[PDB]
DNA sequence: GTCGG
DNA sequence: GCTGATGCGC
DNA sequence: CCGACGGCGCATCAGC
């Protein structure tokens, strides 16, 4: 927040890109920029500063010269009245509306929350659920609520078999002091990369959790990848309701996908990129050789987030150090 | 929108 | 009824 | 100056 006017401002641009425009690249491009000042260790004092960096432009540099002398942007006041924009921009923050949708909704006169409400019946089962919750899910979990549904998961995983491993990943990982949601990775010794499928190796963990009534509802559900919704048992003030994520993933591919589900978004962006630019692809769940012709070879051994640190040659950075 | 081809 | 096409979130 | 920029699991539904 030492420029967090400008990385403001940025955001901004990047979410009406991605809500409005449908530019996806240009959403990434400014996210791109609004990560690279963040990280900049100075106060920029003019566009030919934040130009120096990699990710910034010419359009960029212009945009920040505008702020700086001005402290505000014309384009973002004009987005901020025009109806459309504006309203395009206020339904993709129901969960389960994005761009299309909401330009649909949009397009039919549809433009608030109550609007919503008074045509739920064109809501599908996920866009429900998110207008249910709708300021529920725009609170952040402070680290202490995060700690107590660490605790509830692992213990109800434990129930199921004490062979599961839950990791909680994402931001709570990272070590933030408040979160956006619960992301848990899963493991058990009978799902490897090879291991013949076993159905309800996920659906044993989720049902277990929904009769301790800690998870409420669900958004999608499959073999591999749960989202839903949990909420802390309420002796007194009902607690907010909580976006979980869970994912089930091969034993041995365990530590790229602590790594992958870690982060941060940016950061991983960032590792795939640096891994080309030294002859390996990353993904979820594997770190593989590239070479000549584009021939990824078999994934490499790892068994530490460290040890493919190593085949990068990136200096281990501490999950706190990955909020990016 | 930005950068490397 | 089905499934390719597409959206959404991540 | 142009083209690349990450891909996938899951849900829904237009068009047969
Ligand atoms: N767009 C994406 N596509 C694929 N993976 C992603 C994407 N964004 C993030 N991830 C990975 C890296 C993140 O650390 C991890 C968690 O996603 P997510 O829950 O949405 O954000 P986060 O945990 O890093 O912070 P927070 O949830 O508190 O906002 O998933
Ligand atoms: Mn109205
Ligand atoms: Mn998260
Ligand atoms: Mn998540
Ligand atoms: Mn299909
Ligand atoms: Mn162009
Ligand atoms: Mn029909
Ligand atoms: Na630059
Ligand atoms: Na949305």
């Known amino acids: 927040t030492l420029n967090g006017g400008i990385t403001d401002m940025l955001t901004e641009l990047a979410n009406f890109e991605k809500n409005?425009?449908?530019?996806?690249?240009?959403?990434?491009?400014?996210?791109?920029?609004?990560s690279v000042i963040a990280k900049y260790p100075h106060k920029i004092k003019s566009g030919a500063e934040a130009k120096k960096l990699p990710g910034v432009g010419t359009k960029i540099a212009e945009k920040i010269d505008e702020f700086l002398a001005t402290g505000k942007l014309?384009?973002?006041?004009?987005?901020?009245?025009d109806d459309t924009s504006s309203s395009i921009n206020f339904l993709t923050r129901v969960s389960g509306i994005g761009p299309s949708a909401a330009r649909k909704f949009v397009d039919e006169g549809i433009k608030t929350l109550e609007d919503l409400r008074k045509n739920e019946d064109k809501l599908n089962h996920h866009q429900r659920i998110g207008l249910k919750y709708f300021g529920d899910f725009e609170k952040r979990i402070p680290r202490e609520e995060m700690l107590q549904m660490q605790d509830i998961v692992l213990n109800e995983v434990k129930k199921?078999?004490?062979?599961?491993?839950?990791?909680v990943?994402?931001?709570?990982?990272?070590?933030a002091e408040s979160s956006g949601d619960m992301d848990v990775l899963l493991t058990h010794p009978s799902?490897?990369?090879?291991?013949?499928k076993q159905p309800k190796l996920l659906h044993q963990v989720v049902e277990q959790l929904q009769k301790?009534?800690?998870?409420?509802?669900?958004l999608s559900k499959g073999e591999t990848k749960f989202m839903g919704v949990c909420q802390l048992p309420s002796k007194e003030k009902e607690?907010?309701?909580?976006?979980?994520?869970?994912?089930?993933?091969?034993?041995?591919?365990?530590?790229?996908?602590?790594?992958?589900?870690?982060?941060?978004?940016?950061?991983?962006?960032?590792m795939r990129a640096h891994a080309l630019e030294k002859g390996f692809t990353i993904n979820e769940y594997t770190i593989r050789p590239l070479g000549v012709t584009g021939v990824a070879g078999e994934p490499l051994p790892v068994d530490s987030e460290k040890d493919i640190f190593?085949?990068?040659?990136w200096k281990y950075r501490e999950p706190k150090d990955r909020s990016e």
């Open 160 to 167: 199921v078999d004490s062979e599961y491993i839950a990791t």
């Open 212 to 218: 301790v009534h800690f998870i409420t509802d669900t």
């Open 74 to 81: 014309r384009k973002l006041e004009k987005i901020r009245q």
């Open 169 to 175: 990943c994402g931001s709570f990982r990272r070590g």
């Open 310 to 313: 190593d085949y990068i040659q």
């Open 20 to 34: 409005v425009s449908q530019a996806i690249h240009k959403y990434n491009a400014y996210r791109k920029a609004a």
């Open 191 to 196: 799902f490897t990369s090879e291991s013949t």
């Open 239 to 270: 607690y907010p309701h909580r976006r979980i994520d869970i994912r089930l993933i091969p034993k041995d591919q365990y530590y790229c996908g602590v790594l992958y589900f870690t982060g941060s978004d940016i950061f991983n962006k960032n």
